């Protein structure tokens with residue numbers, strides 16, 4: 236279960252970073 | 263002990279909120 | 289059981305502080321680019 | 323409960339390492355920024 | 360009727376018999392005197408309560424009674440039997456506590472950030 | 481004189497008492513004698529795999545032939561629990577990992593930064 | 599009996615272990631690998647070593663009215679620090695490290711631009 | 714009459730030779746059996762006040778004892794050598810985040 240938690244955390248973290256990049260580009 | 267529930271849903275919860283706010287603003 | 293629980297609490301706190309630090313670094317890099 | 327402890331300490335080492343790398347990136351970032359500004 | 364109050368913090372343990380709050384009361388441990396016996400000054404009684412340290416699970420965890428002056432231990436029918444795995448500088452917190460502390464951290468950092476941002480106009 | 485040396489590797493443990501150039505070596509645990517017409521017990525080699533904490537612990541003696549197991553210099557208490565493929569790390573390990581991490585990340589980041597600057 | 603007065607105290611479910619010897623004497627001291635670190639005063643007979651998670655070790659000796667008796671050594675392994683080294687976690691090691699350093703390189707690449 | 718508290722490997726029990734009366738605390742699960750009460754699992758922190766009278770030969774004398782177990786499996790060992798460091802580095806982090814965001818305008 237901690238393995239799944241860390242994997243999900245990393246995937247969602249990368250998604251957050253890329254979406255911050257895309258949002259800050261469109262401003 | 264507290265196991266995953268204290269550590270799994272806690273930070274995943276707030277960061278999920280971060281993604282939702284980001285999507286709406288964009 | 290006692291030692292394990294503090295290990296979990298410490299790793300959670302350190303993960304939170306990691307998220308805060310990465311937000312800081314993103315903010316700084318974005319500012320230097322503007 | 324031993325497996326939980328092993329995974330816990332592995333994650334703790336992971337995150338300490340990630341903190342170290344984030345600190346070095348902050349150091350280079352702030353050096354460059356204070357040089358430019 | 361009034362139940363005994365027990366407070367365990369670190370290793371020191373405080374034990375109270377609140378039946379008689381207007382006077383002093385001695386203490387017993389399976390009709391054997393303990394505390395303040397000119398030796399082992401760590402284990403000692405108080406004016407109204409008990410104060411023990413270096414608590415052991417194997418020994419010193421049995422039947423306790425509070426008794427007035429010159430009173431047989433079998434007079435009072437309200438005894439005391441407790442068990443404790445004393446954990447020095449080590450308390451118990453449940454998941455709502457850590458959730459609230461994390462929420463407090465988020466609230467304070469967000470409030471500080473919003474305040475400095477608004478202050479900068 | 482010298483303490484008994486133990487080097488636990490993986491789930492297998494190792495131990496012997498080599499304090500003599502030439503001498504007879506035995507091994508006793510609560511005055512038992514097993515082996516000689518699970519446990520690895522040789523005439524000069526002792527080992528044990530699957531070291532269970534509960535059923536494998538206690539006292540150990542390594543004393544040459546010719547007497548009872550009550551004259552050797554000292555005993556040994558070995559309350560040990562071991563998992564499958566779990567290396568244990570200590571002060572020397574963490575410092576080396578941190579310093580090599582610094583070296584690697586600094587070198588690669590400098591390389592990419594300089595290459596990107598053109 | 600057998601010049602082996604030192605005996606480790608067992609049957610303690612808590613996080614602490616003890617040792618004792620059967621000898622009567624006054625103002626007894628203890629030896630750690632033969633050095634003067636240990637001391638025992640009156641009113642106390644069983645000496646305390648420490649928790650089993652602190653990984654204690656070394657030599658320990660007890661003596662009484664008899665001359666210098668025959669010591670013994672203890673060893674402990676409870677780590678609470680060992681890390682997994684199977685293929686199920688080193689793969690995560692490498693994935694996390696590579697992803698993080700790649701993100702770092704992307705950031706520094708973009709930083710090496712405007713100047 | 715001192716009431717004896719028996720203890721199995723993972724069961725905690727209270728036994729006395731008359732009806733046991735509940736006034737405050739936790740019983741665990743309701744028990745229809747008389748002259749015996751089952752409390753609950755060892756790791757449950759059972760708190761409670763239990764009251765039962767004397768026996769037939771010991772008629773007309775009450776016997777009330779308070780039972781508490783502190784055997785915690787959810788307690789945390791608090792080390793001051795780590796919490797101080799983590800709180801001070803969090804303070805530094807928020808200070809410097811405030812500095813960075815202030816620099817933004």
Ligand SMILES: CC(C)CCC[C@@H](C)[C@H]1CC[C@H]2[C@@H]3CC=C4C[C@@H](O)CC[C@]4(C)[C@H]3CC[C@]12C
Pocket residue numbers: 252255256257259260261313314317318321322701702704705708
């Ligand atoms: C994860 C951290 C450490 C590094 C991630 C890199 C981030 C901070 C970088 C990579 C590329 C960058 C973007 C590149 C170009 C632009 C366009 C400009 O008009 C506004 C800023 C903006 C939108 C930048 C914002 C910051 C940015 C998204």
